[PDB]
Write an enzyme that holds these catalytic residues in place. Structure first.
Site, PDB file in Angstrom:
ATOM      1  N   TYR A  45       0.807  -1.213   0.000  1.00 29.26           N
ATOM      2  CA  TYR A  45       0.000   0.000   0.000  1.00 29.26           C
ATOM      3  C   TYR A  45       0.832   1.250   0.000  1.00 29.26           C
ATOM      4  O   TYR A  45       2.012   1.249   0.366  1.00 29.26           O
ATOM      5  CB  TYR A  45      -0.922   0.029   1.222  1.00 29.26           C
ATOM      6  CG  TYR A  45      -0.198   0.305   2.535  1.00 29.26           C
ATOM      7  CD1 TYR A  45      -0.165   1.579   3.108  1.00 29.26           C
ATOM      8  CD2 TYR A  45       0.463  -0.714   3.210  1.00 29.26           C
ATOM      9  CE1 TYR A  45       0.516   1.805   4.315  1.00 29.26           C
ATOM     10  CE2 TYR A  45       1.132  -0.490   4.411  1.00 29.26           C
ATOM     11  CZ  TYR A  45       1.156   0.754   4.961  1.00 29.26           C
ATOM     12  OH  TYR A  45       1.827   0.905   6.156  1.00 29.26           O
ATOM     13  N   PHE A  55       2.199   9.700   3.399  1.00 28.34           N
ATOM     14  CA  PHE A  55       2.517   9.461   4.805  1.00 28.34           C
ATOM     15  C   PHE A  55       3.006   8.045   5.104  1.00 28.34           C
ATOM     16  O   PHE A  55       3.515   7.803   6.195  1.00 28.34           O
ATOM     17  CB  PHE A  55       1.352   9.852   5.722  1.00 28.34           C
ATOM     18  CG  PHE A  55       0.127   9.022   5.532  1.00 28.34           C
ATOM     19  CD1 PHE A  55      -0.023   7.798   6.177  1.00 28.34           C
ATOM     20  CD2 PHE A  55      -0.887   9.458   4.699  1.00 28.34           C
ATOM     21  CE1 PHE A  55      -1.173   7.047   5.992  1.00 28.34           C
ATOM     22  CE2 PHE A  55      -2.037   8.704   4.515  1.00 28.34           C
ATOM     23  CZ  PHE A  55      -2.173   7.497   5.155  1.00 28.34           C
ATOM     24  N   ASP A  56       2.879   7.120   4.149  1.00 26.24           N
ATOM     25  CA  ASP A  56       3.318   5.758   4.371  1.00 26.24           C
ATOM     26  C   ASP A  56       3.378   5.005   3.051  1.00 26.24           C
ATOM     27  O   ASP A  56       2.651   5.309   2.111  1.00 26.24           O
ATOM     28  CB  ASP A  56       2.321   5.062   5.309  1.00 26.24           C
ATOM     29  CG  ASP A  56       2.908   3.897   6.052  1.00 26.24           C
ATOM     30  OD1 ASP A  56       4.093   3.584   5.865  1.00 26.24           O
ATOM     31  OD2 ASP A  56       2.168   3.283   6.840  1.00 26.24           O
ATOM     32  N   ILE A  75      -7.262   0.431  10.651  1.00 20.16           N
ATOM     33  CA  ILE A  75      -8.414   1.322  10.637  1.00 20.16           C
ATOM     34  C   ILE A  75      -9.642   0.627  10.026  1.00 20.16           C
ATOM     35  O   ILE A  75      -9.528  -0.307   9.212  1.00 20.16           O
ATOM     36  CB  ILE A  75      -8.095   2.663   9.926  1.00 20.16           C
ATOM     37  CG1 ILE A  75      -7.641   2.451   8.472  1.00 20.16           C
ATOM     38  CG2 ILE A  75      -7.079   3.441  10.759  1.00 20.16           C
ATOM     39  CD1 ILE A  75      -7.555   3.739   7.650  1.00 20.16           C
ATOM     40  N   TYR A 101      -8.611   7.733  11.527  1.00 16.22           N
ATOM     41  CA  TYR A 101      -8.052   8.117  12.822  1.00 16.22           C
ATOM     42  C   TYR A 101      -8.859   9.191  13.544  1.00 16.22           C
ATOM     43  O   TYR A 101      -8.456   9.662  14.609  1.00 16.22           O
ATOM     44  CB  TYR A 101      -6.577   8.519  12.696  1.00 16.22           C
ATOM     45  CG  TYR A 101      -5.729   7.392  12.204  1.00 16.22           C
ATOM     46  CD1 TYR A 101      -5.251   6.418  13.074  1.00 16.22           C
ATOM     47  CD2 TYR A 101      -5.448   7.255  10.856  1.00 16.22           C
ATOM     48  CE1 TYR A 101      -4.488   5.352  12.603  1.00 16.22           C
ATOM     49  CE2 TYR A 101      -4.684   6.202  10.394  1.00 16.22           C
ATOM     50  CZ  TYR A 101      -4.216   5.269  11.275  1.00 16.22           C
ATOM     51  OH  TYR A 101      -3.473   4.198  10.844  1.00 16.22           O
ATOM     52  N   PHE A 118      -5.749   5.778  -0.033  1.00 14.15           N
ATOM     53  CA  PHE A 118      -4.843   4.645  -0.150  1.00 14.15           C
ATOM     54  C   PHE A 118      -4.936   3.994  -1.526  1.00 14.15           C
ATOM     55  O   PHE A 118      -6.033   3.855  -2.075  1.00 14.15           O
ATOM     56  CB  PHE A 118      -5.154   3.545   0.870  1.00 14.15           C
ATOM     57  CG  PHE A 118      -4.926   3.944   2.301  1.00 14.15           C
ATOM     58  CD1 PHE A 118      -3.678   3.768   2.889  1.00 14.15           C
ATOM     59  CD2 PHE A 118      -5.948   4.458   3.061  1.00 14.15           C
ATOM     60  CE1 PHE A 118      -3.459   4.107   4.220  1.00 14.15           C
ATOM     61  CE2 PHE A 118      -5.732   4.795   4.390  1.00 14.15           C
ATOM     62  CZ  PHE A 118      -4.487   4.614   4.970  1.00 14.15           C
TER      63      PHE A 118
HETATM   64  C1  LIG Z   1      -8.958  -0.461  16.046  1.00 18.89           C
HETATM   65  O1  LIG Z   1      -8.862   0.672  15.185  1.00 18.89           O
HETATM   66  C2  LIG Z   1      -7.565   0.962  14.867  1.00 18.89           C
HETATM   67  C3  LIG Z   1      -6.628  -0.034  14.604  1.00 18.89           C
HETATM   68  C4  LIG Z   1      -5.312   0.291  14.274  1.00 18.89           C
HETATM   69  C5  LIG Z   1      -4.922   1.625  14.208  1.00 18.89           C
HETATM   70  O2  LIG Z   1      -3.645   2.012  13.888  1.00 18.89           O
HETATM   71  C6  LIG Z   1      -2.636   0.991  13.802  1.00 18.89           C
HETATM   72  C7  LIG Z   1      -2.745   0.153  12.526  1.00 18.89           C
HETATM   73  N1  LIG Z   1      -2.406   0.891  11.286  1.00 18.89           N
HETATM   74  C8  LIG Z   1      -0.991   1.226  11.037  1.00 18.89           C
HETATM   75  C9  LIG Z   1      -0.478   0.521   9.778  1.00 18.89           C
HETATM   76  C10 LIG Z   1      -0.818   1.336   8.524  1.00 18.89           C
HETATM   77  C11 LIG Z   1      -1.312   0.374   7.448  1.00 18.89           C
HETATM   78  C12 LIG Z   1      -2.672  -0.189   7.831  1.00 18.89           C
HETATM   79  C13 LIG Z   1      -3.669   0.948   7.950  1.00 18.89           C
HETATM   80  C14 LIG Z   1      -3.223   1.892   9.060  1.00 18.89           C
HETATM   81  C15 LIG Z   1      -3.370   1.185  10.404  1.00 18.89           C
HETATM   82  O3  LIG Z   1      -4.499   0.857  10.740  1.00 18.89           O
HETATM   83  N2  LIG Z   1      -1.820   2.373   8.911  1.00 18.89           N
HETATM   84  S1  LIG Z   1      -1.657   3.831   8.086  1.00 18.89           S
HETATM   85  O4  LIG Z   1      -1.086   3.624   6.719  1.00 18.89           O
HETATM   86  O5  LIG Z   1      -2.971   4.522   8.071  1.00 18.89           O
HETATM   87  C16 LIG Z   1      -0.514   4.724   9.058  1.00 18.89           C
HETATM   88  C17 LIG Z   1      -0.889   5.414  10.200  1.00 18.89           C
HETATM   89  C18 LIG Z   1       0.055   6.110  10.952  1.00 18.89           C
HETATM   90  C19 LIG Z   1       1.400   6.119  10.583  1.00 18.89           C
HETATM   91  N3  LIG Z   1       2.439   6.733  11.192  1.00 18.89           N
HETATM   92  C20 LIG Z   1       3.646   6.584  10.623  1.00 18.89           C
HETATM   93  S2  LIG Z   1       3.437   5.615   9.253  1.00 18.89           S
HETATM   94  C21 LIG Z   1       1.772   5.412   9.435  1.00 18.89           C
HETATM   95  C22 LIG Z   1       0.815   4.728   8.691  1.00 18.89           C
HETATM   96  C23 LIG Z   1      -5.860   2.616  14.476  1.00 18.89           C
HETATM   97  C24 LIG Z   1      -7.172   2.291  14.798  1.00 18.89           C
HETATM   98  O6  LIG Z   1      -8.085   3.261  15.061  1.00 18.89           O
HETATM   99  C25 LIG Z   1      -7.624   4.556  14.680  1.00 18.89           C
END
Ligand SMILES: COc1ccc(OCCN2CC[C@H]3CCC[C@@H](C2=O)N3S(=O)(=O)c2ccc3ncsc3c2)cc1OC
Length: 128
Positions: A45, A55-56, A75, A101, A118
């Site tokens: 992704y 951002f990622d 998420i 978020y 995404f």
């Molecule tokens: C239960 O609900 C949650 C579960 C997990 C969560 O955050 C942790 C999981 N997580 C991080 C991995 C990544 C890929 C899956 C997608 C996404 C991600 O979910 N990021 S993201 O791309 O939106 C993201 C988010 C923050 C971040 N900071 C530095 S790099 C980065 C990337 C947050 C939640 O509620 C806000």
């Protein structure tokens, strides 16, 4: 660009039909099977903010992102969106903050109340 296009031309895939998660299938995947709850899913992704900033990216890490589907490990937009994908599919998802978020945001890069874009490729899924 692609974020505008999914905003304006995407399909609402939410159960509530509240337009919180919009999707476009960019590359059609294989067969008709989508993953099931609890499967180990492997994705590549890239994510962008509404200000255009990346951002990622898993591509940039040279390894996929792996999680168990439907368990809130990601998420809400991802649990919902990845559940619609076929193996080999690439899609675009436009995620309102209620499915991402929220008001909290996520340090260091995701602000409060952020709509996220995404591109996601479903590499594989397997039951454990
Ligand atoms: C239960 O609900 C949650 C579960 C997990 C969560 O955050 C942790 C999981 N997580 C991080 C991995 C990544 C890929 C899956 C997608 C996404 C991600 O979910 N990021 S993201 O791309 O939106 C993201 C988010 C923050 C971040 N900071 C530095 S790099 C980065 C990337 C947050 C939640 O509620 C806000």
């Amino acid at each position: 660009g692609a974020p505008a296009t999914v905003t304006e031309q995407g399909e609402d895939i939410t159960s509530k039909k509240d337009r919180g998660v919009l999707k476009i299938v960019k590359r059609v995947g294989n067969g008709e099977e989508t993953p099931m709850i609890g499967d180990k899913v492997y994705v590549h992704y890239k994510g962008k903010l509404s200000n255009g900033k990346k951002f990622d990216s898993s591509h940039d890490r040279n390894e996929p992102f792996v999680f168990s589907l439907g368990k809130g490990q990601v998420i809400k937009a991802w649990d919902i969106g990845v559940a619609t994908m076929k193996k080999g599919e690439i899609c675009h998802l436009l995620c309102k903050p209620e499915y991402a978020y929220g008001s909290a945001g996520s340090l260091p890069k995701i602000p409060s109340n952020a709509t996220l874009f995404f591109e996601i490729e479903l590499l594989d899924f397997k039951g454990e």
